[model samples]
Target chain A: TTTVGVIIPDISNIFYAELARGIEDIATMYKYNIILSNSDQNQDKELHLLNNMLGKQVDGIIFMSGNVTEEHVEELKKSPVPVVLAASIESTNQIPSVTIDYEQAAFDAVQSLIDSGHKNIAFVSGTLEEPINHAKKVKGYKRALTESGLPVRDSYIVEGDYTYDSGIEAVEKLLEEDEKPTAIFVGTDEMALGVIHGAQDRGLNVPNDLEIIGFDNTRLSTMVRPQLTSVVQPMYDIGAVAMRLLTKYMNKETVDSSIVQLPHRIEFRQSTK
Target chain B: KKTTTVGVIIPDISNIFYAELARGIEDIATMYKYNIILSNSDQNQDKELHLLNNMLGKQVDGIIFMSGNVTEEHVEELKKSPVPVVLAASIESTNQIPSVTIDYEQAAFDAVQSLIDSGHKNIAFVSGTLEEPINHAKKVKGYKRALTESGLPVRDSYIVEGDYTYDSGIEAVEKLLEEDEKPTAIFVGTDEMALGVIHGAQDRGLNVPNDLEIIGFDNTRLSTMVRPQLTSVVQPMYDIGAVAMRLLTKYMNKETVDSSIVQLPHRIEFRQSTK
Candidate 1:
């Protein structure tokens, strides 16, 4: 009977596609249909999409993006309808959001590699402009290395564009280093697949030669040979929870917490020794 | 702004192919200043019927429907729809519904013909459910025609059913390999399922295009992601969605259209999966 607008960064990526599916499932269960729009992670487009949804008189909105800047938060704050963030990050935490603690998750993934006697760990991170990559994931990776007394070599950190091709390029760059990393932590699973295949393409055996740990633990993790060990962020649950939270705010249901952080754990697989 | 709304019902939202199709539809819809109401049917008949009813109840300006199966019951329901309806990438046997799609049968024939011309006689077909007209009436017909025209016997054992999932591709290939007669090449119904077949063959220590060759349908991004990239049929999924929405807008605006049944062209993309 009611409508909820969903703004996704990109549906071509399986992570966000699964998240949208979760959001739609929950919305359908709550008797709400979704007005879905793709922002392509563009700031201006996101703002325009939000405005259009508002004009359509959507009851609430669930927003997902890699980069949530102050401008976005400001626009969201001005919205008459409730807005919830799903698997997205905002530095100020002013917006109601559902996400896994990226910093802690990154730390746990990197620390496991350290405990396995790996001294040089490479981080194939997503865009540094996004807070989730630089401020949260990379910071946690550095903290793990620093606490372990390992050298925080800038050469070991390669920036990726959150793509399979970029992951391959990142690993190739790392391989060209003077002292290549013994283990690598990839920010996303699609990129992790590229890294795994990239290493194999260069005749380096995964785990035996270069262990890999990827984030998001998407279906792609298990799809590859020598399956990837990854941080389980519960992507679908985040979307479902975010939509549920939005429904709560829309129906004026009593809510104890605005910020929801679901649990995260590492799934050990063949990619790790 | 009170804009017109178009209801889009997709069978599966997680599949990249459908996502790409939906993206094309949305881009054109935005251009037309129409708000899109999207719903996932999960390939369930009940869900599809319910979604259609709900959309009709919403008084949407038009409907863009994408599903693998279009049963007689579905046709009856769709015939009663008050708003203009356009089927995207879905085949209806009745041919009464206005739709935009490529020649699935011809596309499959071309892909199989390529494999056959390369001296592959024992070819396998990993396909979706036979109940769906797209698979049964279209793709399978092409596969059989290609074999029959080439004077190759159509082996029933070689044709395995897959639900169009990546895992199902693996299972379908495994089933084909377990048969007494092994196929040297396979024609998979979808790109996602084809990736599974490639990996499954590799897991068995079979070299692609040497020990076995593969050709997948729908030239999705996944086609290039695999090693020995898949040779696929370029079905133009995005264009199908875009053209279908554009057609719906024509019907909604009472514009005189050239043809209701729009048949888009398809081509075969040669990749490393085939020699």
Candidate 2:
């Protein structure tokens, strides 16, 4: 029996885990098996996983990635198997991808924060580089500021590496600055949890001392003291769509659609006042 | 139209350990284009036994399982298992079941030795469950051996047990601090518990590595999330699952692979917990 390959960033994170569930669900439905690998976002690791999965003779691949370079595209071009990008798309036209409208999602999230009377908004991002998720979120923040006639301060944005510690570090950097924003919008729920923890460490109550918002309302949203108000992305749907599309490719079926973009919703919860 | 389906039996979906392993198996299963089904055991052995029996009875081509506890009953269940069964993490019925694991004893020994080498004399061992089989026992044994080899007394007061939960890790530290002679270093059996220990220690005005050092087993991603990142033993958890799935595929193809037992490498992740 031939196998399909599904490469993901990291399963330790909840978003990827849920997406994996969706992939497995559809794969089971379609009578397809899968080979899986995690890159942890290291370029070498990504290369190794791709090579290893390919070497295993997978018929196709579904990849959810954050770090994709030109080399990856070239590799995919030459690969014997069909490949579909999921959750994240590094480039357009070169590879088929399934993702949500990140810009609009960010716009909605930031607009919600702005509507909450948070004028001096601080933005904490997982990565300022690439900005597929973070950049679009930042764009939404800026757009919201522009629409509301609020000045977007250059210093208000703090960059993070999409980890919990990065969240803490970002908040620490923000707290040390001369001007402090009353509301903070962080990209990625994991980093937002860190920001919450950081605030707690400083004896600051969330939504009280500072209203906070985050994206990708992952399982971590519930674990926090004041459950985070976040932009909920259909992580599972992203995986399901990617898997469905890949299966169609594997069966030599004519592709009806090249791009699949899911929708996001803002979950109003306790994090914002 | 497919006659074969592989059942992946896991303990917890939320925990990184099981989730990552599941990813490995799912990736491989997807590659092979084989039908895959997931069953959650929720760490309940009865549920595990029942699910295993049910899935096996349904004639799954093979099984990849990760368990919190493997008992004699599980061994008996494996003996009756008609299809190929591979233990992804927990080991039970070692003879009949193909299993993959890290050398927990060696990993634990290295974790404690790192603390010992860093000039820590009074060390404590924290575990999820003292009575648990295989992995937990091996970890405890390695901790004791390290202390004995260093000529340091193994104090009963130093061996703390938790339910492997974050709250339990906090309680373990609280109990440790209540002792007249507090331990200067702690070797936690799991990463989650280690985080709790750090928070507990910090809450009491103890600075990590300066006042107390901590070493954790399972170099989970959380190890790096904390301020004084935990010094931990890296378990090739996902690899273990990945390798197990690979082996199961070989077995299903009636191909010859090595003996069912496979051991992966372990390394120490140096972070802020220990200098």
Candidate 3:
């Protein structure tokens, strides 16, 4: 049986966990076993795992991380086995990857809030250091505001570490402003839950006083009291497709496209009015 | 580095508790210059056996296995394996295999005892499948013992079985609430289910810790994410995984094995869910 090495950013996050399930299920169907490892998004750790897996001579690798730097792409380029990125982005576009159009997804999420008569909107985004957040998500957020004829208030946008607590902290800061946002667009579902609870803790009625939407559409989107409305990124499909694509390269099958982009849409839930 | 490889088999990867455990196991394995190969069993008997055999075929140095249901057949298969196998947070009926875990029975008893001591008579137990020894033989036994020792009746209606999901937790509490004897306190088998129970109760206009107190097992990150944070048993999921892998290394290296079955300490973390 063939072995495919999988390096994920974090297993504790359900998003990556679900993605792994898809990868493993597809790998199993193709009669390939996986050697899964967590990189925790640390560059050094990721490189170490990559080198180790390459040394083991695995058939291929399915790499998933929030931030894929130029150095990462270069390292992956040197691998003897085929490498595919799942739900991760690389600015250089030098690597084969499966992902949704994060920019368009972010634009649509913010556009929904704009269409709901929300002028004072706050954007709770993940770290700006990552290209996915800075180059893709934030760019799309700004584009939507610009196209909607709305001024992008610097104070309205808060950066979170993509954690539930950081979401709470971000919303708290937004609420303290003299001109508070009527609606919030959180970058991830986990953080969206924090924003919802944070607003509630401050005695604000959801949808009535504050409207919120999140990205990823993870399981956490529905776990909250007022379920979060989010952008469906199809994380599982990304993993499945990336692994399937890698198998094609491994088996020396004909490939149509090096880059795969899945669809994204807004899933309306109780959090939105 | 040509490090020795260890194969790890877990029931679920989507669950944060298991993920945390896997992280712990990986960290320790890396520290010892050992590579790990992980597989999800999904708690399916056939899949569990298949994965075990497959890992063995890969010629791994050792194996760290975790599953809710450890039948006699599984023990038989494991015993016949040429390589050492260490179970993490898994309980077998007979102590035929090396394992590392906390005393689930005593931990449950202490959690329920605390609720009982706080003047809560009608307590509900939202447990995982009763077929699993971890729930039936250990946790449930502890729950019954706590109630029996306190002279409280072990109400059959209060025992609700859940699949240890957040949604299952909600459904379990809803079933318990429909019964004539509504429990003022609930002891959930896992933190995810505990979140559901708390939310389900709150959805029906009940104040947490005042109208209903909940204590969850496994001090996962989800325990604190909820409002009126859950009071839970610190089962040391990470330590269990790390220690189990460490134990397997000792056996694989032909080193002295001090106590094949290691039981770690467990404590209750008091949060807003408990008064």
Q: Could you estimate the TM-score for every candidate?
A: 0.94, 0.64, 0.95
Candidate 3's residue-wise lDDT over A66-157, tens digit each? 78888888888988899998888986677898999999999999999999898988899989898888888899999999999998999988
Interface RMSD of each: 2.2, 6.3, 1.8
Which residue runs does candidate 1 get wrong by more than 4 Å? Answer: B1-6, B28-35, B49-60, B76-82
* C-alpha lDDT values of all predictions: 0.88, 0.78, 0.88
By TM-score, who's the top model here?
3
**What fraction of the true interface does each of the listed models get right, in terms of native contacts kept?**
0.47, 0.19, 0.65
CAPRI class of candidate 1 = medium
What would the TM-score be for candidate 2 when compared with the true structure?
0.64
Name the better of 2 and 3 by lDDT: 3
Each candidate: chain B TM-score: 0.95, 0.92, 0.96
Model 3 spans with C-alpha error above 4 angstroms: B56-59
Candidate 2 local lDDT, B108-208, one digit each (tens)? 88888888888888899888777666445688888888989999889988998898777788899999999989999999988878888987898888999
Residue-level lDDT tens digits of model 3 in B1-275: 44698988878875578777877788888888887777777788887888787777766789999889889999999898888998988897688889998999999999999999999997989998888899999999999999999999998888889887789999998998898879999999989999999989989888999999999988988887888889999988777877887789888988877788899999999999998
